[PDB]
Amino acid sequence: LLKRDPLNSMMNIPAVLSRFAGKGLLLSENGYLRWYVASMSIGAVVVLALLMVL
Amino acid sequence: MTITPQNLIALLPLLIVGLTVVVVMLSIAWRRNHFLNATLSVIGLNAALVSLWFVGQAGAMDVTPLMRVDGFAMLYTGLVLLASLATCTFAYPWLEGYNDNKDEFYLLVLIAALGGILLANANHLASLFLGIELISLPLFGLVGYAFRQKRSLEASIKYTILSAAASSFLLFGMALVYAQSGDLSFVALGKNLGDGMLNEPLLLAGFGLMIVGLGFKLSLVPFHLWTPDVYQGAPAPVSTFLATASKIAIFGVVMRLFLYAPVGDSEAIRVVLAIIAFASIIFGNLMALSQTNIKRLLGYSSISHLGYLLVALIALQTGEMSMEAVGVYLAGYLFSSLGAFGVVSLMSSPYRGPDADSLFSYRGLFWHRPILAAVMTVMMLSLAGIPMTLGFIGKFYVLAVGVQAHLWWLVGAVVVGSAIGLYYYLRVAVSLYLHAPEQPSNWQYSAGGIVVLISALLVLVLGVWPQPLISIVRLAMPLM
Amino acid sequence: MIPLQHGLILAAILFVLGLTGLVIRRNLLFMLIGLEIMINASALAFVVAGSYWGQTDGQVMYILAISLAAAEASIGLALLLQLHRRRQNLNIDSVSEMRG
Amino acid sequence: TEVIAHHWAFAIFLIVAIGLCCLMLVGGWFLGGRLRLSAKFYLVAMFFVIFDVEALYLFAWSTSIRESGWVGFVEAAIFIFVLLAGLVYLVRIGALDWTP
Amino acid sequence: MEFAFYICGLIAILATLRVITHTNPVHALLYLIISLLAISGVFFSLGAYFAGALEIIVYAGAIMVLFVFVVMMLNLGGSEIEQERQWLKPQVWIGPAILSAIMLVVIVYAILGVNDQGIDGTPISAKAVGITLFGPYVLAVELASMLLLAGLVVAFHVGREERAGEVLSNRKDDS
């Protein structure tokens, strides 16, 4: 039952999570300039909202 | 206030760079020569460095309400000047095989060096705005210098539009903080407030819009989406310049703004930059994982390194050594990125026309040019926070600053981001030593070679012995 | 007579409309037009801020703003001309060859 | 009690000038029963724009010529020297001649 | 001069609103011209005579000139883009508009909470701008001259013809 290493698997699911998060985050780099301006506006909204909340 | 004759001594590097700008332009008009203009630009930057030494012989004073010259300004002026020198020495072999005019590149590099010096000396909001715009606007024609090529033109388009948008954001935020506080100086942005009134809405929102603009200019999250396309599309000396000198000057003016203004005691801007630094480190190290192109990977690495700068900046009001840590990490990052982009520029030289695709293919680089592979893997070790390199000294300073003021989340973010980063750093380092599936005698190519190997010797020496760097950084202390 | 809030709200509304026209439109020329709208909005906000305190720094910042607007308009229009001469279209979603 | 009359005179002058042009146009109306131009035109327009914005600094210099001493004259002189260096660079490269 | 300021602001907002949601670009540029005229009137109403005179001299007398010069040069009417009519579709229209309107409401919430001393009189003429333009702010105009020189160099290097002819039909990738 242990010959397929369970603890090595549970210790390299951080690598799987990192690869999944990198592949998910690379969808934002689609190369569209309009989405770049939209993301700039989204970040500005987020920064202003976080400043007004605090 | 008026400018005295003795105040002209502290102005000297800026005057020398402007004089070499007009001298280079007159030489272009008279002759239109490549080697003469490159030599004039190099001589002007070297004379600006000797002028910086002359400034160090003189005092440290406020020249105008726009500019105050001190050790911080001298250090950042020197870093920007040597980065511009490296850009010129990497750009001459690239421009040797260029079909169109090849002197406006040096003119724009000199003007952007002037903008970086202005940002280094910037003690004012107008000075900050003018400095970042003097950095941004020559870089438009620097990125789109190979506008015959498709990707360079696209990168120039993206950079121009997003920089205009972020300049509008910064200008509106600066207008808001001018409407709130009736002085445009750095030191008088919250002097009219007190007794816990400092968290006012207008000043905070204006500083948020300024944070948006400067986070575009420092490739922070989520304003970092311009970074890989601009790094890839632009020519490799342009990528070198807009990675090292532009970002060094913008972070220097950001540090001076957050040090001199009394909004550093505000516990909302600090939390916003903590979130931004956390997300910048984590996100940049995440999207640099599955990258095959070296320029996009270096762009995400730059995103992570400005994240490390930002966490070094958060503890500025408490750690008491944050300026020294930022200076040391910027010296290490400047030399490491200079060496890496110098290898990129030397291997992608000359231009070889716009029809041929300018892919790098770093695999098998050791089997035809071993010295370039050696300096490239030295810089790849340096960017990972790995010892016997100066990048480890900078990472140690950043971690000490983060753990001195008890930034546990940010320290954990730095540790996780470095552990993620060394994966692709050593992947590139191994891949440049593997077997190539498929597959230089000039004086200036050799000049770029000694420049990159001098950078390699510098990072190795200051990794095994960083004490002269600490001595020359601590000697350059701003006036509190 | 005129409160600062109304002028700053007018400048903010112009900035919002310029950003909206910059995002929602695919044409590069209209994108540059929206960029100049946001630049003029920030310049107007600086003018109101300078006129409120009675200082002349707002008008100097307006001069710097319109100098930046002039040079950036020149650069963006040169890039627009090159994009038309090469791609023969001005769709900003068409020039997206750089994937992640 | 004089500048209000002057502003009123300016207002009626503008209003009745546009009204005269409108009534003149509608009285004329009532009675009776893929290519590209060039790039040098854009270049000369951009020369006009950049030199007009530098002329703006000369515009603002001309009003405060006496209140600023010889140091202001030196600063405007090196400004004009940079302007003329740019203009003579433009002259000598060949981008300013037409040659149709 | 307060009702003039309010009406100039209202027609400036209206003119730029017709700028944003227009179809052919020359009418949008005309609407931006009258919007810049209205913002110049706003500048005049607040005592910034130099600012409004500058807006019509520079922003409306040179910059809109460059925009209409390019438009009238390369002969766009918005061809192949008017017939698509992407901006007058709602699934693209709600998103950025409500996002940037959330930005609008949060930034005008940040506008309020500041003490109101009002816009005073004492119109700042060009003499004050001159005496503070070559006093404390010398390096501003010197390095702004350098910045304009850099912008001229960038746009000239990017956007010249490289071909001979005062009438040119469009070739792909310039022959």
Domain CATH number, residue E14: 1.20.120.1200
Rg (CA), chain E: 21
Structural domain contains residue E166: no
Query: Nearest C-alpha of chain E: how many angstroms from B123?
Result: 12
- Could you list the residue range(s) of the whole structural domain that residue A22 is in? 1-54
E82 burial type by CB count under 10 A (0-12 exposed, 13-18 middle, 19+ buried): exposed
Range list of H helices, B432-466: 443-464
State which fold the C4-87 domain adopts: Helix Hairpins (1.10.287)
Structural domain contains residue E175: no
Residues 55-114 of E with CB under 8 A from C: 55, 58-59, 62-63, 66-67, 70-71, 73-74, 76, 78, 80-81, 86-87, 92-93, 96-97, 100-101, 103-104, 107-108, 111-112, 114
> Structure solved using which method?
cryo-EM
Number of structural domains found in chain D = 1
Residues 21-60 of D with CB under 8 A from E: 34-43, 45-50, 52-54, 56-57, 59-60
Structural domain contains residue D98: no
Q: Do chains A and D touch (3 or more CB pairs under 8 A)?
A: no
Asked whether C38 and E36 are in contact (CB, 8 A), the reply is no
The first and second tokens of residue B424, run together, are 């692709």
- Sign of the CA dihedral with E148 first, then E149, E152, and E158 last: negative
Rounded distance between C-alpha atoms, residue B20 and residue B114, angstroms: 10
| Length of chain C as a residue count | 100
- From the CB of residue B451, how many other CB atoms can be counted at a distance below 10 Å? 20
Q: Give the H/E segment covering residue D49.
A: helix D40-63
Instruction: Give Cα separations from D80 to B463, C45, D68, D76, D85 (angstroms).
Output: 49, 30, 16, 6, 8
| Length of chain A as a residue count | 54
- Could you list the residue range(s) of the whole structural domain that residue E151 is in? 2-159
Check D93 against B22: CB less than 8 A apart.
no
CATH number at residue A52: 1.20.5.2700
The set of residues, in sequence order, having a beta carbon less than 8 Å from that of D20 and lying 6+ positions away, is: none
Rounded distance between C-alpha atoms, residue C77 and residue E67, angstroms: 8
The set of residues, in sequence order, having a beta carbon less than 8 Å from that of B96 and lying 6+ positions away, is: B34, B349, B350, B442, B444
Three-state SS at B105: helix
The first and second tokens of residue B357, run together, are 């695709």
What does the buried/exposed string (b/e) look like for B197-217 if buried means 16 or more CB atoms within 10 Å of the residue's CB?
ebbbbbbbbbbbbbbbbbbbb
Percentages helix, strand, coil for chain B (3-state, rounded to 5) are 75, 0, 25
Check B178 against C50: CB less than 8 A apart.
yes
The first and second tokens of residue B225, run together, are 């989406």
D76 burial type by CB count under 10 A (0-12 exposed, 13-18 middle, 19+ buried): buried
The first and second tokens of residue E175, run together, are 């022959």
Number of structural domains found in chain E = 1
B205 interaction partners in chain A (CB closer than 8 Å): 48, 51-52
Structural domain contains residue E116: yes
Asked whether C20 and E99 are in contact (CB, 8 A), the reply is no
Q: Give the H/E segment covering residue B300.
A: helix B294-314
Residue carrying the six token digits 């039909």: E169
Instruction: Give Cα separations from D84 to D36, D42, E142 (angstroms).
Output: 32, 21, 14
Check E114 against B180: CB less than 8 A apart.
yes
- From the CB of residue B396, how many other CB atoms can be counted at a distance below 10 Å? 16
- From the CB of residue B464, how many other CB atoms can be counted at a distance below 10 Å? 12
DSSP string, B191-217: TT--TT----HHHHHHHHHHHHHHHHH
The first and second tokens of residue D85, run together, are 């260096």
Residue carrying the six token digits 């929602």: C24
Rounded distance between C-alpha atoms, residue C56 and residue E126, angstroms: 9
Q: What's the resolution in A?
A: 3.6
The first and second tokens of residue B316, run together, are 């500025």
Percentages helix, strand, coil for chain A (3-state, rounded to 5) are 80, 0, 20
User: What SS3 string covers E7-32?
Assistant: HHHHHHHHHHHHHHCCCCHHHHHHHH
- Could you list the residue range(s) of the whole structural domain that residue D49 is in? 2-93
- From the CB of residue E98, how many other CB atoms can be counted at a distance below 10 Å? 11
Number of structural domains found in chain A = 1
Q: What are φ and ψ of residue D60, in 5° steps?
A: -70, -25
The DSSP secondary-structure symbol of C56 reads S
Three-state SS at E58: helix
Structural domain contains residue D30: yes
Instruction: Give Cα separations from B288 to A19, B98, B362 (angstroms).
Output: 10, 31, 16
Cα B230 from chain centre: 14
DSSP string, D66-96: TTS-HHHHHHHHHHHHHHHHHHHHHHHHTSS
The DSSP secondary-structure symbol of E171 reads P
CATH number at residue D29: 1.20.58.1610
For chain C, the structural domain boundaries read: 4-87
Mutation target vs C (from B178, B181, B192, B239; most C CBs, 10 A cutoff): B178
Q: What are φ and ψ of residue B68, in 5° steps?
A: -125, 125
Structural domain contains residue E74: yes
AA identity, residue C57: D
Asked whether B380 and B426 are in contact (CB, 8 A), the reply is yes
